[PDB]
Design a binder for this molecule. Structure first.
Ligand SMILES: *[C@@H]1O[C@H](CO)[C@@H](O)[C@H](O)[C@H]1O
Length: 36
């Protein structure tokens, strides 16, 4: 589970995609998404 400020899954990012409860995956850019 992706911690706060971690990359939650942009294009190609097959790592931790689900953010910690309370943090939401914010797709900031096509490849950069951050759990906020
Ligand atoms: C949030 O936590 C993940 C591991 O769960 C780590 O890879 C991230 O870098 C961190 O921000």
């Amino acid at each position: 589970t992706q911690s706060h400020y971690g990359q939650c899954g942009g294009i190609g990012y097959s790592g931790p995609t689900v953010c910690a409860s309370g943090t939401t995956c914010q797709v900031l850019n096509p490849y950069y998404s951050q759990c906020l």
